[PDB]
Amino acid sequence: MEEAYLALGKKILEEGHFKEDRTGTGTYSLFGYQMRFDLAKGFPLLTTKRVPFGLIKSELLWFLKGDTNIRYLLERNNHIWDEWAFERYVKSADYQGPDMTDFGHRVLQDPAFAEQYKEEHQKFCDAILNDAEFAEKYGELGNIYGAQWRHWETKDGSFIDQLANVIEMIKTNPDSRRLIVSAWNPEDVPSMALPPCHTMFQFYVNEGKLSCQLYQRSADVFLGVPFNIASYALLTHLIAHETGLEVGEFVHTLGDAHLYQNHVEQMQEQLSREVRSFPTLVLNPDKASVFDFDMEDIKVEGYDPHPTIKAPIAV
Amino acid sequence: MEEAYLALGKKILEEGHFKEDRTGTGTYSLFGYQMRFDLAKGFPLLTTKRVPFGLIKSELLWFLKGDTNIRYLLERNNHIWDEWAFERYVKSADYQGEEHQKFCDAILNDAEFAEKYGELGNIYGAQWRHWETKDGSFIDQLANVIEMIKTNPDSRRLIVSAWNPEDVPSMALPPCHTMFQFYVNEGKLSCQLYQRSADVFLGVPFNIASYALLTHLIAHETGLEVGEFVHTLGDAHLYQNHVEQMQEQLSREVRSFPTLVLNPDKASVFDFDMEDIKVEGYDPHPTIKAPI
Ligand SMILES: Nc1nc2c(c(=O)[nH]1)N(C=O)[C@@H](CNc1ccc(C(=O)N[C@@H](CCC(=O)O)C(=O)O)cc1)CN2
Ligand SMILES: O=c1[nH]c(=O)n([C@H]2C[C@H](O)[C@@H](COP(=O)(O)O)O2)cc1F
């Protein structure tokens, strides 16, 4: 239910402990939460604020083809991953622009500096889009989601195709209590841009409906969780389609759920708006496998949200 | 609360989905479930039925010490993990086929026999303290995370995983307790356990006590107060011939939990033994016997 996501946000606002975080921004936070979304009751794309389904749609596609380089996201005009690639870049020997230490916060503080940033980030983007060698070096975020989903590296010079394996298991072994996918690779976690927040997920089959639980170690509640919800609903639907099942529930389970302190006002304005109907998701029936979908194959129809509420992303 | 666990047994009898499998076992289950235990209210040993604290503490001390060999467990009268060890020996070259008591004695007295026959391969001890990397190294998750709590309490990365997709397809007993996360605030240590598969009458009691004990041990080691243990379930199943038991348990009135007393004259929990963990004021209802 939309109300479930809203109730969490309210609860964090109302009874969240204040907490310093890796980004030095400041958060309000709980530990341990669970919300359920019945997918039969609408595709859970938030209606109390416009959420851009395109960006969700193309980040997931990016996950599904194993890709960890942001060039693909740039091609489809998705900048939601840029900052971490930009951070790697500025901190390398190859960057000789103006100083960028702590840019996450400084572009909020100083307007002149935000022009300096706006420029350098632009150049970064264009370099990624056009120089292949640059792209190869500075578009790469490490063995994040696509790598662990598609290409978990084995001790003996090979790789496990975790997503595929589990889709196949749904088909032949639906009562399996082992239908798990993990992004959490201890080996790789030091070398990733950010260790997987949406960390592990598990599937369940009952009476011809597929349900999914995701275990999220860390949830940015205003900016993060709207995306994640929609992302995992999509994936459940796409897997349903393949495996010929109907949709069950998404269960979203959180460790540290938190509100960035400069999202407090946004969440407040969000909380005063009236919930509307979730839209309907329509898939292209011609496409056979989860790995076969492209962006024009997934649409959400009947989506009438309240206006965008903008907020700054904590780097 | 204890009543949080009892809600789950009740919900499964009320609305759990029945499933019969390739082995013939019937189960009523649900999918996705969160319980909370505030450990300042008392250590979560179920009062509605005796839960034996001896085996849980030997098992968890075994897990914490990296051990994957049953010698330790045997020294302490914990037989939980005999079976795969005795199976392998009965198939081995030096057997001349009452006999389980002679294997056990072998494991206890002959050091050479043990480093050969009491060894289980990939289990919690291996997963928590010895995750093999590609090059041949090993990662000590539990350790690093202990270090992480000390130096960086605010970290959102306080994770231990027992789930390796390379290892799972070939392992006899893939891990039920799939991963868990620590979180620190206001000097209190909390723990959430994601568990992919849950035996509600039999497993879940044992489970709640193990992870609460760990939360206390880690707490004690990093010098902190305990907070909550949050228990999250994937597929949570009541076995078809545990139903009458569950009904009997649901009649009994709830009593206050006991109080965990740890021994203060020992600094590291890495030198903890059975005598350093005791439970005071434990007053449960009688055991409810039930087929494993
Ligand atoms: N602090 C933080 N870091 C994170 C995440 C996060 O949610 N929070 N992520 C979580 O996945 C990843 C990146 N995901 C993101 C998801 C949404 C937006 C975002 O800014 N959405 C806006 C902008 C949309 C637009 O401009 O068109 C919005 O909807 O307001 C950014 C990153 C990795 N790092
Ligand atoms: O899928 C994701 N969802 C999400 O909410 N984050 C957010 C959560 C948190 O605000 C930050 C991660 O920082 P840390 O690793 O320090 O928790 O990114 C990241 C992802 F990759």
Author numbering:
A (entry chain B): 1 to 315
B (entry chain A): 1 to 97, 119 to 313
Extract from the study:
Thymidylate synthase (TS, EC 2.1.1.45) is a ubiquitous enzyme that catalyzes the reductive methylation of 2′-deoxyuridine-5′-monophosphate (dUMP) to 2′-deoxythymidyne-5′-monophosphate (dTMP) using N5,N10-methylenetetrahydrofolate (mTHF) as a cofactor. In cells, TS provides the only synthetic source of dTMP necessary for DNA biosynthesis. TS works as an obligate homodimer, having residues from both enzyme subunits that contribute to substrate binding in each catalytic site. TS subunits are characterized by two domains, known as large and small domains (LD and SD, respectively).
The structure of EfTS in complex with the substrate analogue FdUMP was determined at 2.88 Å resolution, consistently showing subunit asymmetry within each enzyme dimer. FdUMP populates the active sites of subunits B and D turned to a closed state, whereas chains A and C remain in the open conformation typical of ligand-free subunits. In subunits B and D, FdUMP binding is accompanied by the accommodation of 5-FTHF in the cofactor site (the same cofactor analogue also entrapped in the active site of the native enzyme). FdUMP occupies the substrate pocket, where it mimics the dUMP binding mode, forming similar interactions within the cavity. Nonetheless, the 5-fluoro-uracil moiety of FdUMP is positioned closer to the catalytic Cys197 (distance of ~2.7 Å between the inhibitor C6 and the cysteine thiol). On the contrary, in the complex with FdUMP, the thiol of Cys197 is reactive and can form a covalent adduct with the inhibitor that, indeed, is positioned closer to the catalytic residue. In this arrangement, the 5-fluorine on the FdUMP uracil moiety is proximal (~2.7 Å) to the Tyr145 hydroxyl, suggesting the formation of a halogen bond with it. Indeed, the pteridin moiety of 5-FTHF is accommodated just above the 5-fluoro-uracil of the substrate analogue, placing its 5-formyl substituent proximal to the FdUMP C5 (distance of ~3.2 Å). In EfTS, 5-FTHF, having a 5-formyl group that replaces the methyl of the cofactor, acts as an inhibitor, preventing the formation of the ternary covalent adduct. Therefore, our EfTS-FdUMP-5-FTHF ternary complex mimics the pre-reactive step of catalysis in which both substrate and cofactor are aligned in the cavity to allow the transfer of the pterin N-5 substituent.
